Design an enzyme around this catalytic site. Structure first.
Site, PDB file in Angstrom:
ATOM      1  N   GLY A 112       0.794  -1.208   0.000  1.00  0.00           N
ATOM      2  CA  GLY A 112       0.000   0.000   0.000  1.00  0.00           C
ATOM      3  C   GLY A 112       0.825   1.256   0.000  1.00  0.00           C
ATOM      4  O   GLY A 112       1.721   1.420  -0.833  1.00  0.00           O
ATOM      5  N   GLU A 113       0.537   2.138   0.950  1.00  0.00           N
ATOM      6  CA  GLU A 113       1.118   3.466   0.984  1.00  0.00           C
ATOM      7  C   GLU A 113       2.512   3.482   1.584  1.00  0.00           C
ATOM      8  O   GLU A 113       2.748   2.930   2.658  1.00  0.00           O
ATOM      9  CB  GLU A 113       0.152   4.446   1.657  1.00  0.00           C
ATOM     10  CG  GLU A 113      -1.283   4.269   1.153  1.00  0.00           C
ATOM     11  CD  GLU A 113      -1.530   4.277  -0.356  1.00  0.00           C
ATOM     12  OE1 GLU A 113      -0.614   4.652  -1.125  1.00  0.00           O
ATOM     13  OE2 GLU A 113      -2.652   3.900  -0.770  1.00  0.00           O
ATOM     14  N   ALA A 114       3.449   4.090   0.836  1.00  0.00           N
ATOM     15  CA  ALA A 114       4.874   4.102   1.157  1.00  0.00           C
ATOM     16  C   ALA A 114       5.196   4.430   2.603  1.00  0.00           C
ATOM     17  O   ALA A 114       6.037   3.753   3.197  1.00  0.00           O
ATOM     18  CB  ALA A 114       5.625   5.032   0.220  1.00  0.00           C
ATOM     19  N   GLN A 115       4.503   5.407   3.189  1.00  0.00           N
ATOM     20  CA  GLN A 115       4.749   5.783   4.576  1.00  0.00           C
ATOM     21  C   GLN A 115       4.545   4.643   5.552  1.00  0.00           C
ATOM     22  O   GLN A 115       5.417   4.404   6.378  1.00  0.00           O
ATOM     23  CB  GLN A 115       3.886   6.971   4.998  1.00  0.00           C
ATOM     24  CG  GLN A 115       4.344   8.308   4.440  1.00  0.00           C
ATOM     25  CD  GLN A 115       3.563   8.716   3.212  1.00  0.00           C
ATOM     26  OE1 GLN A 115       2.971   7.887   2.505  1.00  0.00           O
ATOM     27  NE2 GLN A 115       3.551  10.009   2.932  1.00  0.00           N
ATOM     28  N   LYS A 116       3.410   3.941   5.477  1.00  0.00           N
ATOM     29  CA  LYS A 116       3.122   2.906   6.458  1.00  0.00           C
ATOM     30  C   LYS A 116       3.844   1.589   6.181  1.00  0.00           C
ATOM     31  O   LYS A 116       4.070   0.825   7.121  1.00  0.00           O
ATOM     32  CB  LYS A 116       1.618   2.699   6.627  1.00  0.00           C
ATOM     33  CG  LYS A 116       0.935   2.162   5.400  1.00  0.00           C
ATOM     34  CD  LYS A 116      -0.073   1.108   5.769  1.00  0.00           C
ATOM     35  CE  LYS A 116      -0.666   0.468   4.541  1.00  0.00           C
ATOM     36  NZ  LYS A 116      -1.351   1.458   3.661  1.00  0.00           N
TER      37      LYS A 116
END
Length: 347
Positions: A112-116
């Site tokens: 999913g999202e790079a940050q998490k």
């Protein structure tokens, strides 16, 4: 003044307790922040980090995407101490980095999202560091384990991608070549990369199935005229017969329908394809469970009638193949109807 019936509150302890629990998981699978406090308020888990940690790794009905979306938050501290708590009861000792990532990836979706993603990896890598310090020591910069974990994820994606020709996929030497100088200018020992490559090739890294997995494998069997949202769960499957006119009889088998009952939605389908150990279903129509009531009926032509209504008035009429399937289906549909109604929170 009210006579005691089987519908008295004295008999609904079990039903209402389990209803709340399912609602709690339903609020988690939509928004893990509202979901989690819902279950401590009702006492389904303590307000302890390890408590919520033991809960997220063992309880069924939680979306692994939504668990990773939760455990991957930098803001909240509890999420970080639940994350550190979830990595704590996972022992990565006498194991290579890829076998540790596989075990970690079995519980939490790492996509999913790079940050998490960076964060579950960040928190995973350090648990791998604490547990096998020795391996960490033959690294110039321990920051390289974090880089290597992402390289394994990148290797796995590429290797089992349906979008790349097998000959344009990453060869062992392409994997080694791409990691040249990664360790602050030095290379990672090549037998360690041989191991990694040689075992992802043996077995793809796969997240454990959850309730979303079943809804999407059912969804791929329906040819439309999009139900695998993380909160949606499959409750039951049932064969019924639709009744255009309950005041005339019909031949048996006519208007055969295959029904899928989800926790917030009822979909009516009809068999499309036939053999090969399965089938597809032509989607006919779906119903929201809100404002819906189930009226049981029968006449001289339909001994096991089911009627669906609303007053927000006849949605459809069904006849069940027998009384048992009738009791079972209507009991589930009434419980799913009550689940949806109770859920209409007015905060």
């Amino acid at each position: 003044a009210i006579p005691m019936s089987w519908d008295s509150p004295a008999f609904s302890n079990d039903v209402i307790r389990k209803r709340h629990y399912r609602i709690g998981l339903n609020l988690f699978n939509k928004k893990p922040e509202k979901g989690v406090q819902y279950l401590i308020e009702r006492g389904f888990v303590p307000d302890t980090p390890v408590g919520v940690a033991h809960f997220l790794l063992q309880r069924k009905g939680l979306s692994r995407q939504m668990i990773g979306e939760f455990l991957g938050n930098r803001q909240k501290q509890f999420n970080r101490d639940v994350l550190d708590c979830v990595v704590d009861e996972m022992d990565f000792s006498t194991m290579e980095l890829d076998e540790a990532l596989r075990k970690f990836q079995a519980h939490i979706r790492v996509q999913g999202e790079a940050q998490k993603v960076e964060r579950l990896i960040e928190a995973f890598s350090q648990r791998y560091c604490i547990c096998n310090p020795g391996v960490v020591r033959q690294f110039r910069n321990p920051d390289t384990i974090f880089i290597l974990a992402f390289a394994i994820i990148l290797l796995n994606t590429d290797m089992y991608s349906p979008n790349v020709k097998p000959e344009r996929k990453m060869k062992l030497e392409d994997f080694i070549k791409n990691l040249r100088g990664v360790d602050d200018g030095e290379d990672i020992p090549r037998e360690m990369l041989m191991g990694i490559y040689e075992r992802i090739r043996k077995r793809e890294l796969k997240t454990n199935e959850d309730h979303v997995s079943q809804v999407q494998k059912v969804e791929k069997l329906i040819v439309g005229k999009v139900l695998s949202l993380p909160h949606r769960r499959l409750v039951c499957y049932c064969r019924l017969f639709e009744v255009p006119d309950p005041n005339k009889p019909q031949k048996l088998g006519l208007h055969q329908r295959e029904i899928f009952l989800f926790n917030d939605l009822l979909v009516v389908t009809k068999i499309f394809q036939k053999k090969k150990n399965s089938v597809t279903y032509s989607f006919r129509q779906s119903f929201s469970l809100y404002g819906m009531q189930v009226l049981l009926f029968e006449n001289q032509y339909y001994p096991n009638g089911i009627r669906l209504t609303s007053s927000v008035k006849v949605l459809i009429n069904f006849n069940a193949p027998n009384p048992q399937d009738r009791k079972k289906f209507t009991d589930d549909l009434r419980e799913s109807i009550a689940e949806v109604q109770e859920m209409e929170k007015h905060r």
